[PDB]
DNA sequence: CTGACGT
DNA sequence: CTGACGTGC
DNA sequence: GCACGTCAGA
DNA sequence: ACGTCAGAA
């Protein structure tokens, strides 16, 4: 009665949903705890262009614990999606909405534009081998040992409003085969650092246990799974093997495609620059035919 | 085709309730992130004996989540109420569940049993002015700029479930005149060092604004408080004066001859206090008292 | 008052 | 795909 | 400053 | 699990 007279603090973790994403957003570091999202075949296509979005605050954060563009901008770290642009092609509003800060964690570039992009790859690849793809992903902050043995937790703030930079990131992927298929349902979790990696880690170096992850993370995913369904592992009942540097660069020409000039040959100039072999990539074709 | 198909995550920050406090767990740090509690005159009063009892963990906490005893002994760090068990007097059960992790964060030894201990003393002596007086305790991890210009947040964690160490603790304190009154509320918000503070530091001197505080703690105190009406000062409308080291050291003196069970024990305690040259009726009455024994 | 450790 | 960064009204 | 054009990522 | 021991000059 008189202990909440005048109500409890908040602590603003409520769930918030938007069109093909949810989070669950932390108001002392600026940024999402997790972000949930679903990927499909039909959600990846589409004529969404992120050309058309731009980062802004979110609208629904209180002003006082939202990050701004300010915060980003020259701070030498990149604004890293957790639920991905490219997987809400479906839908110009679903998108935009990836655009918010609510959205964004201060992400390393060579992190966010490769190592990072390549898991976003996988799951998007998932999608041609399970009907239904579940995905939650978020920043961490993990201890390390000092000098002295001790453990310390230690991590980079920007801006003027202090946006924490993790030093981890994290994602679990949940794929179900089939609305109607018996099969086991995959899981993965995975914990990638905030830094540069090359093609030579496999994606199953960063793997840990469901139940490890929680433990860091002081989250609990997924928590209507019935823990007595069949679950696999989805590196055993899936390759959970990210494109090379061949099947990247060659993937990424063929987006690039899509631009506006006769600059195609300055892109066709760095495909035998890192001698990439001539993939059909017939599009050049449906391009200007 | 739905996004909430196997459940959104759970973070595990709802409110839980206690006898005479409540609390949001933050399970990632194994501490609260908030403990709020109200006391009043008839709160402190009472016989409940903290000697009977325990620190232990929460039952209600997931123990995947909890912290334990192991990771607290011998860390270097003490156990820190937020709800202090003083509050407690006039309930055995309130008392008990103030030792409950859930309550409980990594505090400088110094700093627990000193300076904080005089805040929350002074907490409890604005029950002699104020009928209802609203506390929310907590810690913080605060940032830090090096010599290179960026800025970094560094704690420790201890023990195997890696419980976080504050920087600094904070406490809002509304202070309700009377529940019939006109008078405006009282409030006050402090942040101060998890480190030994002397005798030095008046209380004001750690005081902060409530939209600061509220900005670094990512939290949002007393949201049914009227911050439109006229809120008053506390440290203006009231003290803000935390006791000095002779009152401080004259009532802990007095409390330490009542557990004199050797007279060797009382005659050290006699020595330890004439160095501040005191001497007080009722410690002079209760020496003698358990002095002849 | 707030905490601890030794049999 | 993922982003930043250099201009120009 | 904030919206486009150009460039880059083992 | 329970009696001691300590806390700005
Ligand atoms: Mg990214
Ligand atoms: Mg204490
Ligand atoms: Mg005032």
Same mark, same amino acid.
């Given at each position: ?161 202090? !946006?924490?930079? *993790? ?11 089939? %609305? #109607?298929? /018996?099969?086991? +349902? ?33 989250? !609990?995913?997924? *928590? ?11 590196? %055993? #009942?899936? /390759?959970?093997? +990210? ?23 300055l892109e066709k100039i760095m495909e035998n620059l890192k001698n990439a072999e001539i993939e059909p990539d017939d599009y050049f074709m449906?391009?200007?035919?």
């Open positions: 009665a008189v202990l909440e007279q005048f109500g409890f603090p908040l602590t603003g973790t409520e769930a918030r949903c938007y069109t093909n994403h949810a989070l669950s957003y932390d108001q002392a570091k600026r940024v999402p705890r997790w972000v949930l999202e679903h990927i499909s075949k039909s959600k990846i296509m589409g004529d969404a262009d992120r050309k058309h979005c731009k980062f802004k605050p979110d609208p629904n954060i209180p002003p006082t614990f939202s990050a701004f563009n300010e915060d980003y901008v020259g701070s030498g770290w990149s604004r890293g999606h957790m639920a991905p642009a490219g997987n809400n092609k479906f839908s110009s509003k679903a998108m935009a909405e990836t655009f918010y800060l609510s959205n964004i964690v201060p992400q390393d570039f060579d992190n966010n534009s490769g190592y990072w992009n390549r898991i976003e790859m996988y799951c998007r690849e998932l999608t041609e081998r399970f009907e239904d793809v579940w995905v939650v992903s978020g920043p961490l902050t993990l201890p390390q040992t000092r000098g002295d043995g001790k453990k310390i937790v230690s991590y980079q703030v920007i801006g003027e409003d202090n !946006v924490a930079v *993790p030093s981890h990131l994290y994602k679990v992927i949940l794929a179900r085969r089939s %609305s #109607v298929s /018996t099969e086991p +349902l995959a899981l993965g979790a995975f914990v990638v650092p905030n830094e540069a990696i090359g093609f030579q880690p496999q994606l199953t170096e960063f793997q840990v246990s469901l139940q490890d992850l929680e433990k860091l993370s002081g989250l !609990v995913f997924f *928590p209507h799974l019935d823990r007595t369904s069949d679950i696999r592992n989805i590196c %055993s #009942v899936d /390759t959970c093997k +990210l494109l090379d540097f061949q099947e990247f660069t060659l993937y990424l020409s063929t987006r690039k495609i899509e631009g506006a000039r006769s600059v195609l040959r449906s391009r200007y035919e």
